Amino acid sequence: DTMESIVLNTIVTGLQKEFIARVIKTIGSQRSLQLYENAMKVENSGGLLTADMSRRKTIGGVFCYLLKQLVAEDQITIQEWNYIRQ
Amino acid sequence: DTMESIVLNTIVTGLQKEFIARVIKTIGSQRSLQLYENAMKVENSGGLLTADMSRRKTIGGVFCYLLKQLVAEDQITIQEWNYIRQ
Secondary structure, eight states: OOHHHHHHHHHHHHHOOHHHHHHHHHHHHHHHHHHHHHHHHHHHTTOOBOTTSSSBOOHHHHHHHHHHHHHHTTSSOHHHHHHHHO | OHHHHHHHHHHHHHHOOHHHHHHHHHHOHHHHHHHHHHHHHHHHTTOEEOTTSOEEOSHHHHHHHHHHHHHHTTSSOHHHHHHHHO
């Protein structure tokens, strides 16, 4: 949790703090960074569309879709997903 | 080595390998992310102006300039710098 302050701020700045603090607390700074990176790779590939297809998702939205993919793949529990989201 | 393998890929992805690896082996994962993060904030406000009045407006160019300044500020020794430049 000094490496976690740093991961915290890096991710926070990279996506444009408590919501990210809760992700780090839940999956660790290691898996958090991999998620930030993956969101960046998606952005480098030209992004994703919103559900209404009117714009690209912001990189914040991409990271949330990816995080939600962690729940779909049974990596984060439903309880953990609820803690993170409010 | 897995955290630093992940800091490696995060920073490489965000900058758009070997060069960044040596930075990490030199200053530590913690300080490298701080630097990557500071490069990001600096890029967001339009980058910077070097001593030669040369604009650095992309993240990578910014990141490179801030790295060189650590040397000029005696936070990275000459020997280390030489190790990193190749």
